[PDB]
Design a protein around this ligand. Structure first.
Ligand code: CLA
Ligand code: CLA
Ligand code: CLA
Ligand code: CLA
Ligand code: CLA
Ligand code: CLA
Ligand code: CLA
Ligand code: CLA
Ligand SMILES: CCCCCCCCCCCCCCCC(=O)OC[C@H](COP(=O)(O)OC[C@@H](O)CO)OC(=O)CCCCCCCCCCCCCCC
Ligand SMILES: CC1=CCCC(C)(C)[C@H]1/C=C/C(C)=C/C=C/C(C)=C/C=C/C=C(C)/C=C/C=C(C)/C=C/C1=C(C)CCCC1(C)C
Ligand code: SF4
Ligand code: SF4
Ligand code: SF4
Lengths: 95, 33, 80, 138, 151, 161, 742
């Protein structure tokens, strides 16, 4: 019974929108590229590999020239765009 | 300087305590009915 | 409040009453002019002091005069 | 007499409406009757639709009410509007038109307030009335 | 499906009901804050608010003050926070002196006795929170270096 | 001479100013080929500088210790051409302009629409007026003495005192 | 069909009668003057067409023909620049030696000693040095002789005559109807595909067929007189294929989509040409060709007589959500009925584009030998920055004019405009708070640094050798753009600009472009820029949103867009109109653009521009003082204002003395403006009463009664002389400094 306003009950559909937007953004971004930023992997997989690499170096943050920041920014930008569009499509149309 | 303690005693008082008490009491005076 | 005076040079053209945004002025019966009416200011507690009435007055130097005085919530035009 | 049960124009609301001083110091009300539902501009910003029949609306200032009255007079030919002042105690003071006749028309019983019996050039000098409770008008 | 409605179903009040202003999350957070939470004396509202604000006040004074590169940086930062707390308590006191008439009602914040209780609670909470932050930064090297001790 | 100043034709600092100006133009002249238009222009500038300094040195102008001509304007006849005679020339031209403008204003007052005469000038009548201005002192004085220049104080609007 | 040509023939007779009736366009003004105020009013409302008549058709016809007149004036101006380049310039000598000949296309007559302004500009030439960059444009276009410049001047003059004839024809002989003007879809299709698309395509044609071979021969060292004429490059395909062998293959690779064959004259090289310091012209040719294709594609989007196409009303009305009510409904009617709304949008867009032009043109120099021409770079950056700021504020002004005049609440119920008006208080309050926050945490850093450096506490300052404010995001973006060639743009040989990082491109021992590092001072000045822009937005947006009414004045729309006040009541209602908000926002725009161009001038002189000497070291103009001095106001006052004004104040007796004279005169006009800005009308009217008594005593009082300027005119005159004085002072200071040291 989440009210989005004073008297406006609205279903946020956070599980569906989150899961569907995550899958619909991650799966197309599994397309590989041979550029050094990706390293032979897709955008999502290069991002996850960079997460593992930098978590193997805790305290020490990723450097400026490290591909982690660019991978994180592009991946989260596309994810946020997918989440916004998925929220619009599922909450509005619902069919 | 003779009585060299007097600047370090009086300058914080004159510059922080005097204006604070003046501003507080003037505020009370100008806002009371 | 502001003080609004109407002098006997008034010709009763009712322009100052029509120009008043705050309903301060009104026309009352008089015999001093050809129109048979003079402006009056019974409600100067609502006067904001905009001097639109003086702008509307056509007599050489004005018949209606606004003297700004003590400021109140109404005269300052405060919606808060 | 202000009927508090008069319906209001359909308005979506705005941040320009009345503040805490309306419920604490004084508030103003304007009522009018329209022949049809039609869109007018709010004096606080925004468009509202007045209903067919009676309309009651609340404002913070008398000038806002009279601006709305002038707008509905000159754009919709509505002249039956009434402006009231309401206090927090519940007292309603009828304001406009004060005697039922608009102030630009002469009405019997009105007495002149603030009338001076000479021209403006006949006022007294400030040095004449200094240290003295005489008015500058004489 | 409209998300913005007139505030309190009143189209002529100077406010709008928005998701930032009137959602369930906003209403829960605002009603659960100590300044608005039901069942609290004004003194305890003051205690909670003072604990929070006085606790976080130590940090900027300790890390950025003129004595920040000295061995007495934390002591100076806590003393600066205490001086700010005393100044703000004087501000609260003079606000309550000029703002409220002496009434029997004392269970509300916006009463004279209620504001005095709130000021007392805010002073005691602010001193306690600043002292707690001082203790934690004095005894934990992680807080002294803001995490750089891990590197 | 006057006020301790020296005549410019014998002041050494006047000569130093002339020499410095000529040298400053000649070092610019050195970078251009003879017969090029910049060379001719620079040589003409050198000639104008030399002629100006010669004329100023032979005019009885007084130079101070700075090396520049100083004008005397106390009324003495040995320096009447430095302020007094240019002053008479200005006063003649300015009285001409004022007289013809006043005459046009008084003509425009007689027209059907005076303001149209102010914004759209009657050019033949204005040219007649600007021709009339050569005898402006005598005409203006006769206008004054006949009561046609000054209007009395009871016919001019004034504010309440 | 629905989109058709409808015209009225001979609507307005061509006559000189109304030329003799000033104020004929206005019923108020046509009665003639009675006071001098009329005169000012006659020049003040004259091109305000909607206030003279209510017919939208007549207004649209006047607008169309006035636009033709402006195009005629612009073409005459261009023809003048080409002619003065042809006859009064050293352009051929500059073509022979670009690195040592200062461009000059103005020669003065000798009258009163002003012949000193004909400075020794090189090439055996004396004249006024010009900084508009026309020499570099003509070199990029392949103009090698002054005969071609004469022909260009003739073409400009002929186009000026054609435009002025078209204005007379399309107003006085064949005026289009209102239905012709109200085709937004057809106008957008034709102007996207035909104006921008075919224009880009034809300029790509000129670049590929003319500019590339002539500039390739020029960069190889061929003298301009031995280069073949452009038509010889057109007809001799062997001569063209000697430079670009793909021209031996003809147009077959284009039509068969074998486009990589054209890779020798359509490149994606990036960086700069090492010989000239400009962009590769092959890159510009592919750029303009790709833009032509994209624009022609975009010009087929909108619906016209045939059934295909988008309807913009449908597009607008479909985009609406739960936060926004009716959404973008009603905007098509506004933008097809109100000329002021279109002028607001287009002025805002043109101003933003001019600002983008200034940034992108300093950073990626597009013309040969323009990067090392530091006066040209500084002049064009400053000029297009000023034009952009003025146009953006004009967009706000004409938005306010739409809001007062053309806005109809009946046609605007619960759409985006109505909801913006209905939460204007929230908008303006949050903007006010963010402006105060930006002012404190940007300018108080400078104040804090002034105090710390004055108190002898250097370790307490905000600096790179002190408590640091690193611009980490911009540095990260610079690292990305430096790493981009071969990684995120794999087919680009070099970076988009060397300002992000890379090598020092130097031409003739002068830095064309080098990396522009960002430190604490760059952080502080970019957040100063953000503060000034947000405050200008606050003033202009508050004026637009409160143009019709407010809590103070509930009937402000009845008073109009431009009124002085509503009297001394309500405490005082001075400067309450939207016009007065534009009046204040012009001052704040001046402040913003002044700080922007000062940042540019100091940063380029300190960290980019300079001379390259042995061992590859770069000696900058001010020797890298920006990092330690631009963190304090004292450093800006001493090391930028005091230090770099030495050239304009010691310019007397040289060719740059006109800049010293203009410097003094602009200080004078700026100070003169404060008489109008600080004073009020009643004082001047009473002083004029005394002067009227003096003229009345001599019977010389004018028939047109002299009045003091109106309150709005007092504000406008003060603002105009203020802007002229300040901009002229910066103009003279910049130009004298950069001509002397660069
Ligand atoms: C492909 C057709 C086409 C083209 C090229 C243009 C071009 C232009 N229109 Mg436009 N217009 C068109 C169709 C077109 N329109 C249609 C169909 C409509 C009706 C819906 C309009 C309605 C319209 C209005 C209402 C207005 C314009 C305006 C303008 C000018 C904008 C200012 C500018 O950048 O000028 C600089 C650009 C130039 C190219 C300068 C040269 C100008 C001439 C006329 C170009 C002619 C090129 C010619 C077709 C081919 C010869 C080139 C070569 C082969 C010899 C510009 C000249 C505005 C203007 O300023 O009007 C005067 C304006 O107010 N247009
Ligand atoms: C980024 C991914 C994405 C995109 C592009 C779309 C696009 C669309 N969805 Mg959709 N959807 C998504 C994710 C996405 N969806 C997810 C994750 C869910 C599950 C929660 C849904 C559930 C959903 C439902 C239930 C329905 C839609 C519908 C629609 C269509 C119309 C409504 C709309 O949002 O128009 C958006 C309009 C556009 C995208 C075109 C305009 C283009 C401009 C430039 C905006 C695009 C922004 C940018 C370029 C996008 C980049 C994506 C990024 C990942 C790189 C439209 C084709 C409705 C429909 O009719 O389709 C059947 C419908 O019924 N969607
Ligand atoms: C003449 C008035 C005056 C005086 C005496 C001082 C004195 C001082 N200022 Mg300064 N200051 C003043 C005016 C004054 N200021 C003004 C007008 C401004 C605004 C521009 C500032 C802004 C300013 C900043 C921004 C900072 C100082 C700091 C300091 C301290 C110097 C560094 C140090 O060793 O602190 C060591 C500090 C301590 C050991 C803490 C002392 C705590 C005191 C004793 C508590 C007093 C409580 C209160 C006043 C009780 C009375 C309340 C009543 C008036 C209502 C010193 C106490 C710095 C500082 O350290 O602040 C603490 C600092 O950061 N000042
Ligand atoms: C500050 C006041 C002052 C004033 C008003 C004058 C005014 C005059 N001076 Mg003068 N003078 C002054 C101070 C002053 N002086 C000082 C301080 C000095 C000493 C440096 C001189 C030294 C000086 C000299 C040496 C001479 C004058 C002369 C004159 C007269 C020449 C103008 C003319 O054509 O009239 C004369 C013509 C008419 C009245 C009618 C012509 C039609 C004039 C009246 C000249 C003169 O003849 O004085 C009488 C003259 O030879 N002045
Ligand atoms: C017909 C021309 C005319 C005449 C005869 C006068 C006469 C006078 N003016 Mg006046 N004035 C005029 C035009 C004229 N004014 C105009 C057009 C302006 C507006 C700029 C003023 C502004 C003005 C001020 C502000 C003051 C005077 C003052 C004075 C008095 C002293 C002389 C002076 O200061 O001159 C100086 C005059 C000026 C600086 C302005 C003159 C502008 C031009 C050059 C004159 C107009 C020429 C006109 C175009 C001729 C057309 C004729 C043609 C059609 C045939 C004197 C009564 C002063 C005063 O009160 O002294 C007691 C004073 O303070 N006037
Ligand atoms: C509006 C733009 C425009 C214009 C008027 C021209 C005009 C011309 N081009 Mg060009 N061109 C342009 C844009 C333009 N071009 C662009 C954008 C490109 C890049 C794709 C080219 C690429 C190009 C090539 C590669 C060739 C021309 C050729 C020609 C000539 C045509 C001869 C012919 O039909 O051979 C047709 C030949 C066949 C084999 C078929 C003529 C001078 C040809 C020429 O004569 O070279 C000078 C030639 O070989 N052009
Ligand atoms: C595409 C450009 C464009 C167009 C077509 C318009 C068109 C219009 N504007 Mg707009 N405006 C623009 C840009 C534009 N503006 C910009 C960029 C600004 C910001 C400065 C404004 C600010 C603005 C305001 C604030 C107002 C208008 C108004 C108007 C209307 C009447 C203008 C008039 O009669 O002036 C007639 C022309 C003049 C008075 C000439 C002005 C001369 C200037 C001030 C001095 C020029 C100095 C020169 C460049 C250098 C001199 C130096 C030398 C002396 C040494 C008209 C609809 C007015 C209106 O009522 O609209 C309804 C109004 O109040 N506009
Ligand atoms: C140098 C002159 C100057 C300064 C400092 C200001 C300052 C300001 N103007 Mg302003 N203005 C100016 C000239 C100036 N103006 C001129 C010439 C015009 C003519 C057109 C205007 C027109 C104008 C308009 C139209 C608007 C402003 C606005 C603002 C405010 C912006 C918010 C801000 O930066 O907060 C931060 C405050 C500052 C940067 C002021 C200096 C404070 C520094 C950081 C030190 C503080 C130290 C501390 C207080 C010391 C205490 C000591 C104790 C003893 C008191 C701010 C109050 C806008 C506004 O009010 O809305 C936000 C706005 O809308 N101004
Ligand atoms: C901006 C943030 C954002 O994402 O807004 C996007 C959001 C878009 O709202 P809707 O989905 O209602 O928009 C539908 C149309 O407005 C767009 O076609 O706008 C709002 O919520 C109102 C503006 C809030 C502005 C707050 C600041
Ligand atoms: C991070 C987080 C994620 C993003 C979103 C976000 C929500 C905005 C953000 C939160 C930022 C902010 C909002 C984080 C929330 C922050 C606040 C500042 C935390 C305050 C804690 C106060 C306690 C510890 C002091 C407790 C008192 C102790 C026990 C005292 C004992 C004392 C008593 C009097 C008795 C005597 C003994 C002593 C010792 C003197
Ligand atoms: S000043 Fe304004 S409110 Fe007061 S009487 Fe005159 S018009 Fe009415
Ligand atoms: S406007 Fe002047 S003349 Fe007319 S009624 Fe009012 S006071 Fe009298
Ligand atoms: S000072 Fe001028 S602008 Fe201000 S209220 Fe008075 S007349 Fe109007």
């Amino acid at each position: 019974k989440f009210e989005v306003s004073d008297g406006t009950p609205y279903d946020l559909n956070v599980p569906l929108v989150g899961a569907a937007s995550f899958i619909g953004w991650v799966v197309p971004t599994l397309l590989p590229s041979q550029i050094p930023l990706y390293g032979g992997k897709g955008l999502s997989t290069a991002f996850f590999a960079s997460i593992g690499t930098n978590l193997a170096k805790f305290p020490a943050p990723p450097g400026m020239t490290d591909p982690f920041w660019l991978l994180c920014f592009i991946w989260h930008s596309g994810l946020f765009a997918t989440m916004i569009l998925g929220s619009i499509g599922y909450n509005g149309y619902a069919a | 300087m003779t009585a060299a303690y007097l600047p370090s005693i009086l300058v914080p008082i004159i510059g922080l305590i005097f204006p604070g008490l003046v501003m507080a009491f003037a505020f009370i005076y100008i806002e009371q009915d | 409040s502001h003080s609004v005076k109407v002098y006997d040079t008034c010709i009763g053209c009712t322009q100052c009453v029509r120009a008043c945004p705050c309903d301060v002025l009104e026309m009352v019966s008089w015999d001093g002019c050809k129109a048979g009416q003079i402006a009056s200011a019974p409600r100067t507690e609502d006067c904001i002091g905009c001097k639109r009435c003086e702008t509307a007055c056509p007599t050489d130097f004005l018949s209606v005069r606004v003297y700004l005085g003590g400021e109140t919530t109404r005269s300052m035009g405060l919606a808060y | 007499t202000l009927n508090l049960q008069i319906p209001s124009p359909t308005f979506e609301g705005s941040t320009g409406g009345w503040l805490r001083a309306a419920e604490v110091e004084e508030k103003y009300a304007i009522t009018w009757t329209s022949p049809k539902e039609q869109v007018f501009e709010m004096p606080t910003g925004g468009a509202a639709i007045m209903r067919q029949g009676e309309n009651l609306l609340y404002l913070a200032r008398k000038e806002q009410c009279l601006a709305l009255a002038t707008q509905v007079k000159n754009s919709f030919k509505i002249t039956d509007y009434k402006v009231y002042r309401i206090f927090p105690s519940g007292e309603v003071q009828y304001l406009h038109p004060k005697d039922g006749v608009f102030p630009e028309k002469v009405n019997a019983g009105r007495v002149g307030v603030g009338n001076v019996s000479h021209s403006i050039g006949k006022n007294l000098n400030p040095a004449q009335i200094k240290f003295t409770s005489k008015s500058f008008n004489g | 499906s409209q998300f913005i409605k007139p505030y309190n179903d009143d189209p002529f009040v100077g406010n709008l009901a928005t998701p930032v202003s009137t959602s369930s999350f906003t209403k829960s957070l605002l009603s659960n804050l100590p300044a608005y939470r039901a069942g609290l004396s004004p003194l305890l509202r003051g205690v909670e608010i003072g604990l929070t604000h006085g606790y976080f006040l130590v940090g900027p004074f300790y890390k950025l003050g003129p004595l920040r590169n000295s061995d007495v940086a934390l002591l100076s930062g806590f003393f600066s926070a205490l001086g700010l707390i005393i100044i703000l308590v004087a501000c609260l006191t003079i606000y309550g002196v000029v703002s409220f008439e002496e009434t029997e009602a004392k269970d509300q914040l916006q009463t004279a006795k209620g504001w005095r209780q709130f000021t007392s609670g805010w002073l005691v909470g602010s001193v306690g929170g600043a002292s707690f932050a001082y203790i934690l930064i004095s005894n934990i090297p992680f807080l002294q270096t803001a995490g750089m001790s891990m590197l | 001479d006057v006020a301790g100043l020296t005549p410019c034709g014998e002041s050494k600092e006047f000569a130093r100013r002339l020499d410095g100006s000529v040298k400053k133009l000649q070092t610019r002249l050195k970078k251009y080929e003879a017969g090029t238009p910049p060379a001719l222009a620079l040589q003409k500038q050198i000639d104008k500088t030399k002629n100006r300094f010669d004329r100023y040195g032979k005019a009885g102008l007084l130079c101070g210790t700075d090396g520049l001509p100083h004008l005397i304007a106390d009324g003495r006849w040995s320096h009447s051409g430095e302020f007094v005679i240019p002053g008479l020339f200005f006063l003649y031209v300015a009285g001409w302009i004022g007289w013809v403008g006043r005459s046009y204003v008084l003509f425009a007052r007689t027209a059907d629409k005076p303001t149209e005469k102010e914004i759209i000038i009657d050019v033949p009548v204005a040219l007649s007026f600007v021709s009339t201005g050569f005898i402006w002192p005598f005409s203006a004085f006769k206008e004054f003495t006949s009561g046609n220049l000054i209007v009395p104080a009871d016919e001019i609007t004034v504010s309440p005192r | 069909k629905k989109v058709s040509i409808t015209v009225d023939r001979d609507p307005v007779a061509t006559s000189f009668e109304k030329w003799a009736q000033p104020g004929h366009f206005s019923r108020t003004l046509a009665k003639g003057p009675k006071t001098t105020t009329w005169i000012w009013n006659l020049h003040a409302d004259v091109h305000d067409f909607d206030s003279h008549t209510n017919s939208l058709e007549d207004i649209s016809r006047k607008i169309f023909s006035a636009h033709f007149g402006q195009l005629s004036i612009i073409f005459l101006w261009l023809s003048g620049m080409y002619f003065h380049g042809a006859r009064f310039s050293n352009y051929s000598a500059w073509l022979s030696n670009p690195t040592a000949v200062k461009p000059s296309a103005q020669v003065v007559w000798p009258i009163v000693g002003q012949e000193i302004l004909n400075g020794d500009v090189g090439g055996g030439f004396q004249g006024v040095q010009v900084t508009s960059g026309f020499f570099q444009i003509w070199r990029a276009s392949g103009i090698t002789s002054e005969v071609e410049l004469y022909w260009c001047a003739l073409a400009g003059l002929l186009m000026s005559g054609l435009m002025i004839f078209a204005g007379w024809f399309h107003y006085h002989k064949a005026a289009p109807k209102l239905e012709w003007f109200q085709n937004a879809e057809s106008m957008l299709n034709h102007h996207l595909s035909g104006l921008l698309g075919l224009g880009c395509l034809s300029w790509a044609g000129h670049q590929i067929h003319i500019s590339l071979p002539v500039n390739k021969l020029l960069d190889a060292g061929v003298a301009p007189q031995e280069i073949p004429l452009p038509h010889e490059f057109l007809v001799n395909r062997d001569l063209m294929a000697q430079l670009y062998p793909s021209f031996s293959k003809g147009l077959v690779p284009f039509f068969t989509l074998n486009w990589s064959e054209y890779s020798d004259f359509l490149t994606f090289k990036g960086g700069l040409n090492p010989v000239t310091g400009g962009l590769w012209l092959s890159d510009t040719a592919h750029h303009h060709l790709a833009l032509a294709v994209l624009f022609i594609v975009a010009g087929h989007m909108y619906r016209t007589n045939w059934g295909i196409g988008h309807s913009m009303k449908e597009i607008l009305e479909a985009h609406k959500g739960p936060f926004t009510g009716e959404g973008h409904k009603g905007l098509y009617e506004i933008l097809t009925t109100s000329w002021h709304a279109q002028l607001a949008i287009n002025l805002a867009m043109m101003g933003s584009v001019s600002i983008i032009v200034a940034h992108h043109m300093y950073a990626m120099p597009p013309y040969p030998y323009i990067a090392t021409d530091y006066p040209t770079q500084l002049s064009i950056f400053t000029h297009h920055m000023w034009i952009g700021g003025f146009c953006v504020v004009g967009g706000a002004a004409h938005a306010g004019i739409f809001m007062v005049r053309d806005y109809n609440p009946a046609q605007n119920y619960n759409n985006l405009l109505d909801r913006v008006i209905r939460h204007r208080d929230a908008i303006i309050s949050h903007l006010n708070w963010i402006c105060i926050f930006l002012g404190f945490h940007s300018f108080g850093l400078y104040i804090h640094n002034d105090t710390m450096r004055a108190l002898g506490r250097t370790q307490d300052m905000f600096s790179d050798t002190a408590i640091q404010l690193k611009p980490v995001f911009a540095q990260w973006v610079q690292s990305i753009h430096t790493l981009a060639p071969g990684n995120t743009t794999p087919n680009a040989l070099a970076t988009a600009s060397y300002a992000f990082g890379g090598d020092v491109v130097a031409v003739g021992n002068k830095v064309a472009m080098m990396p522009i590092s960002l430190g604490t001072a760059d952080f502080m000045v970019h957040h100063i820029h953000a503060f000034t822009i947000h405050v200008t937005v606050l003033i202009l947006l508050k004026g637009v949103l409160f143009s019709r009414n407010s809590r103070l004045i509930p009937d402000k729309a009845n008073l109009g867009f431009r009124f002085p006040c509503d009297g001394p009541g309500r405490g005082g209602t001075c400067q309450s109109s939207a016009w007065d908000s534009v009046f204040l926002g012009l001052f704040w725009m001046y402040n913003c653009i002044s700080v922007v161009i000062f940042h540019f001038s100091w940063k380029m002189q300190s960290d980019v521009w300079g001379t390259v000497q042995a061992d590859g070291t770069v000696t900058h103009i001010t020797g890298g003082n920006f990092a330690q001095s631009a963190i304090t106001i004292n450093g800006w006052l001493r090391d930028f204002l005091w230090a770099q004004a030495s050239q304009v104040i010691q310019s007397y007796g040289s060719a740059l003395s006109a800049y010293g004279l203009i410097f003094l005169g602009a200080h004078f006009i700026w100070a003169f403006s404060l008489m109008f800005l600080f004073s009020g009308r009643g004082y001047w009217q009473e002083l004029i009463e005394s002067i009227v008594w003096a003229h009345n005593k001599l019977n010389v009082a004018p028939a047109i009664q002299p009045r003091a300027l109106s309150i709005t005119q007092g504000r406008a005159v003060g603002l105009a002389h203020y802007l002229l004085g300040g901009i002229g002072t910066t103009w003279a200071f910049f130009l004298a400094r950069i001509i002397s040291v660069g």
